Design an enzyme around this catalytic site. Structure first.
Site, short mmCIF file in Angstrom:
data_model
loop_
_atom_site.label_atom_id
_atom_site.label_comp_id
_atom_site.label_asym_id
_atom_site.label_seq_id
_atom_site.Cartn_x
_atom_site.Cartn_y
_atom_site.Cartn_z
N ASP C 21 19.45 6.85 84.52
CA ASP C 21 20.35 5.97 83.94
C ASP C 21 20.40 4.87 85.04
O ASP C 21 20.59 5.23 86.12
CB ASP C 21 21.69 6.41 83.35
CG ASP C 21 21.78 7.22 82.10
OD1 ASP C 21 20.71 7.21 81.43
OD2 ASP C 21 22.55 7.84 82.07
N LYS C 78 19.52 2.47 75.26
CA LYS C 78 20.34 3.04 74.42
C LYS C 78 21.03 2.21 73.12
O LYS C 78 21.06 1.15 73.33
CB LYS C 78 21.55 3.73 74.98
CG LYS C 78 21.50 5.21 75.42
CD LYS C 78 22.45 5.78 76.49
CE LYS C 78 22.95 7.07 76.62
NZ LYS C 78 22.00 7.86 77.18
N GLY C 150 28.58 12.78 81.53
CA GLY C 150 29.21 12.07 82.50
C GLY C 150 30.38 13.01 83.19
O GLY C 150 30.87 12.42 83.99
N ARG C 162 20.13 26.96 75.17
CA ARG C 162 20.04 28.51 74.64
C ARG C 162 20.20 28.57 73.25
O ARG C 162 19.39 29.51 72.57
CB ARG C 162 21.10 29.32 75.28
CG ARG C 162 20.94 29.60 76.73
CD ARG C 162 21.68 30.68 77.21
NE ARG C 162 21.92 30.92 78.71
CZ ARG C 162 21.09 31.56 79.39
NH1 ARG C 162 19.94 32.17 78.61
NH2 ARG C 162 21.15 32.00 80.58
N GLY C 211 25.44 16.33 82.33
CA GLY C 211 26.18 17.19 83.57
C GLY C 211 25.28 17.58 84.66
O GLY C 211 25.62 18.54 85.22
N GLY C 232 22.22 10.77 84.65
CA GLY C 232 22.99 9.50 84.59
C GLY C 232 24.03 9.64 85.73
O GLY C 232 23.55 9.16 87.06
N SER C 233 25.01 10.07 85.57
CA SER C 233 26.14 10.15 86.29
C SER C 233 26.20 10.77 87.78
O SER C 233 26.27 10.28 88.70
CB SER C 233 27.41 10.50 85.63
OG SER C 233 27.63 9.87 84.41
#
Ligand SMILES: *C[C@@H](O)[C@@H](O)[C@@H](O)COP(=O)(O)O
Ligand SMILES: *C[C@@H](O)[C@@H](O)[C@@H](O)COP(=O)(O)O
Ligand SMILES: *C[C@@H](O)[C@@H](O)[C@@H](O)COP(=O)(O)O
Ligand SMILES: *C[C@H](O)[C@@H](O)[C@@H](O)COP(=O)(O)O
Ligand SMILES: *C[C@H](O)[C@@H](O)[C@@H](O)COP(=O)(O)O
EC number: 4.3.3.6
Lengths: 274, 274, 278, 278, 278
Positions: C21, C78, C150, C162, C211, C232-233
């Site tokens: 991102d 997006k 995020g 999973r 994450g 991203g973050s």
């Protein structure tokens, strides 16, 4: 060790039938049953009665055993290790620690490892089956809904176990531990079961089998054989019902034979919905 | 196999201490700790923060390892087999798959059998301990209530496990199966545990140990040793707190020594009730 | 069919890659320098969007123009769920792929975009097999997990990986007669269920997303069988974005190699602080 | 039996006395100068422990050393409930008595200390007869009420005094056959119930404790038949600690004398403000 | 103490024995002929008392007179819970033992009989250790399980046997400091808890009672460590009372012998039908 299993192996493709007496047991031998299962009462007649159902008088077994030559099996109350002790002493081919009798112990099943006589136990799901085997059962069966003549619960149980094994086989090596916990089953048997894509012992259908069509259906869903009680002797024509069910079971993938032995059978047991 | 256990055995009677850096780790070696447990942050300082707590930068470990000679241990997030892979590659003495870090997998713990590096795991009861060992943990500890400086939860857990083992040992051979089910633990480890009247691996107290009196209490309740983090470096006098705790632990049945090293210690960590 | 096969052909080339991102040119070059196969252009990174109650919409197209002429890797964007007009605009801007994303504020609470009406391939998120298959049924060419965007916490992405992966294996074990009620249970289209069954995988490229804060996190998602990762973050809120970006890529390319994985985690710096919500 | 009788012999000498909580030497001499039969040494007085969420443990032994050599009256200390090791240390320090106290943070939520394993006598708190008898059954040599420690409010201590005192009188009235189900109801050991019944009182010295802020409060507890009082917060958070301390003692010694009780309340100063919780 | 030891001496001689409920002389001789160590004389057997809403009281003493002169084994009787006067009468009739039984209609819902005031030994029922110990604390010389009286179903007796037997083993494992809170939890008198602990068994003879319908049932109770059995309904509501009675006794005497146990179950006849309640 596993002569117990070995003995059970010879049951594959067979029909065991519940009998309360000699004529019934003779009818069963004539039908081609590999064994009889001896009871005070057969499950359908145990259903509107609130009496304490116990294992059968051992004299009754001797009387019957001497009058036929196929394998002889009997029921014991869940948790009643002494009823087992008595019957092991008597020499029976197999014991069924069965929910159809009145439970003798509400928390503990018989320690089945303490017997040379092999044990069959009931089950409705994979964890339960594996717990019975952990206690030493050599063979499993579904519980179905005994004496109702309704195949539906048997079918549920057959598929529940099958689908749980499939979910088990879908899991990676690390995921199997949390599954074991959820099933409340011993990891060691869970892993062996996963190794085979089936239960590690012989596994029969039982409860509510009323017609050759039912018997064959259980077989097509991968069972190794069938127990039938009420379906025979509550039917219009027990010898012929007994014979057809054994044929169905021996020829479960043969529609020609399934048709043939289903023709002209008479009324199956009325059974009981609800 | 069980060189893993063998390695853990040498921990008996020891104190492992949480350190976030070299000075802290040196203080620990000087105190007589058998190992340090390397963290980004120590549990007390992780408690008012809502950040994602991960295993420590492996450079941090190398920096620290070269500056001391006692055993070096580190934390991994529950279920994070790759953080383990990285640290096993780095060669650490032991991994703690720890609830103080932010869980990486909500249903599965690390398959600890896939590592030469031995693992310690947390627990609050017998079934949980036995599930961690089934997954391959070589050592157990209580969870206590990390970073609160309150011994109470640690005590609860020590006694819960002890009393459950006692109930386990009170049961006859047939009763153990239903117990296994209730505990949701594998029968094989349940039976071994019953065979020993203790957990089959080394078992340390952990969480909330704030004074030598606490450390010794855990020892008198039958633990093999102690982990301490917050209690040292949040205390008024960390070197002296560290030293006294190790003495307490090495001399847990000696009131004369417990008194001596408790004198003049300074303020223990304020801690946190609630 | 041929337009579907054409889009799938295109998405395959993302396999093994990392998509990052970005908000600005500065960040996009950090991404290209890191070896990302593409950037995903955003008004705000997801860690920033958790800290506001603003309406979060697709980026001004000017910013896709500006960034795209400063880099040579793939350019993605997006659009808000159900916002077929935002998509029409970016389709007209020509961009390599669109993500109909739950990170932006939904535009339609009942209908996603009819992705079949676009030549641009779409990626959508999922948390289970039925959701994925529904998204693909609407024309998604690619799937990712949602995870917890995020937060810098890997736990939800791992659950989602999973769940889908087990559901796919289980589906393959079912007898053909059992597949109908299972389709009902998943509320998925039977024919995409029969296709997954014949392929023994999702019928599209499938990335991990949400994450991912460290190379250990990325590599874990790959070891669980994903074809790639979005991040991203975790890059630009880390201490050293350049080095975090490059080491993620190496981890994704080398996800089964401890030595490298070790090597790229060394002295990496402080990863995004994250939010393990109160 | 002989060790029990020996400890009881010792505790009798506290009858009629006041025991004062202290943090430091300065406070302990105020207590001795006031005529207290002993001090109870604390890291913090209970009014201070209500105002923090800290873990509250037994005092550093050094502080018992320091205080004890500056005074000649009895020296007591608090240990956390269930913390048998804290007790072992103070047993080794030799102190006149231990209070296994609910004012400190419990160490074991299911088990109190096995008080029989100590030569040092213990005092424990109670709010009713069964609790007292359980505490004595574990080896307490003495009992006090809990009241509401550090609040300066007498109301709970008074409830606790009356409850035990009524339960004791009622127990004595029951027919011998009724005493078994009553023991069950109180969850008390029958044999300590039969003993209370034969003695027509608690089998141990029994003090009032909690929220005693004035001489009127102390004297009230004595008029309700208690053998003594503990006072913590009410002295050193009052305006004039010395004079509040001395007048409490006189009130306890002269609890049935209005004239004195008046005399010692005159111009006493402002009592602890207290906390009648929101 | 000496009266307690004297009663215990007496109860020991019941060890290994069977006690049979009877209504009339005819039944009592069947019991003596069977080898029962005693009969328990009843207005109605428990299977009959389940089928009525009548008040069920101790037997007319005349019937104890009549029966007792026709047999030479022990003679026992039931009194209603809490009915100390019914006991006084039978104490005066001289009978070998009394059962304060829950099968009769309770006379006092809060108090059992103070059994210490009688030279006649009492047996009481229990379903767990605390209950037993409370009963013994009131002076019971002997304990039995309650099971489900008159139902011919063994399931509750087995639960009760196991519960007490496990509780006893667990109690013995506890550290001496843990025994106080456990006593509280069981609401039992500590001193009888310390005694069980030192003996590693119940301090009294302890029989199985309730729902014993076959020799397998009796032998099972013995294999679980009981010292004996009471049987009421299972004999005289069976097909062949004489043979059921004799084979129960042999089973109790030979509870670890399969061969005999087999032998005495052969052709025994139909056991009591029983009631597995709707
Ligand atoms: C849409 C894209 O931002 C995904 O990465 C999102 O679901 C997760 O991003 P992040 O790495 O910021 O959690
Ligand atoms: C333990 C001791 O501090 C007691 O006084 C306590 O229960 C009450 O003290 P205070 O007078 O401070 O309320
Ligand atoms: C009191 C006596 O009748 C006991 O046998 C009773 O609890 C059980 O009797 P039964 O054998 O009739 O169930
Ligand atoms: C327990 C017995 O073996 C088994 O037959 C029953 O569970 C079912 O018998 P049906 O009477 O239902 O055939
Ligand atoms: C996980 C770590 O090893 C362990 O110390 C914690 O659970 C407790 O540490 P404290 O900070 O409570 O001492």
């Amino acid at each position: 060790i596993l002569l117990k299993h070995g003995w059970c192996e010879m049951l594959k493709g067979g029909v065991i039938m519940d009998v309360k007496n000699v004529e019934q047991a003779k009818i069963a031998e004539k039908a081609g049953a590999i064994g009889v299962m001896i009871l005070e009462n057969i499950p359908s007649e145990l259903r509107n009665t609130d009496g304490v159902a116990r294992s059968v008088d051992p004299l009754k077994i001797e009387e019957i055993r001497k009058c036929i030559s196929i394998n002889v099996l009997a029921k014991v109350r869940i948790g009643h290790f002494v009823e087992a002790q008595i019957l092991e002493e008597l020499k029976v081919d197999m014991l069924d620690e069965s929910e159809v009798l009145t439970m003798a112990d509400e928390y503990n099943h018989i320690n089945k490892h303490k017997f040379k006589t092999p044990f069959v136990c009931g089950c409705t799901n994979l964890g339960e089956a594996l717990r019975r085997i952990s206690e030493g059962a050599s063979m499993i069966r579904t519980k179905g809904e005994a004496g109702t003549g309704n195949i539906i619960e048997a079918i549920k149980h057959i598929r529940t176990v099958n689908n749980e094994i499939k979910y088990l086989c879908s899991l990676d090596e690390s995921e199997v531990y949390n599954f074991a916990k959820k099933l409340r089953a011993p990891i060691d048997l869970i892993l062996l079961t996963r190794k085979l894509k089936r239960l590690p012992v012989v596994n029969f259908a039982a409860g509510g089998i009323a017609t050759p069509a039912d018997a064959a259906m259980c077989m097509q869903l991968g069972m190794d054989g069938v127990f039938v009680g009420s379906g025979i002797f509550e039917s219009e024509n027990p010898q012929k019902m007994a014979s057809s069910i054994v044929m169905a079971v021996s020829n479960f993938n043969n529609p020609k034979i399934l048709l043939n032995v289903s023709l002209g059978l008479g009324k199956a047991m009325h059974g009981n919905t609800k």
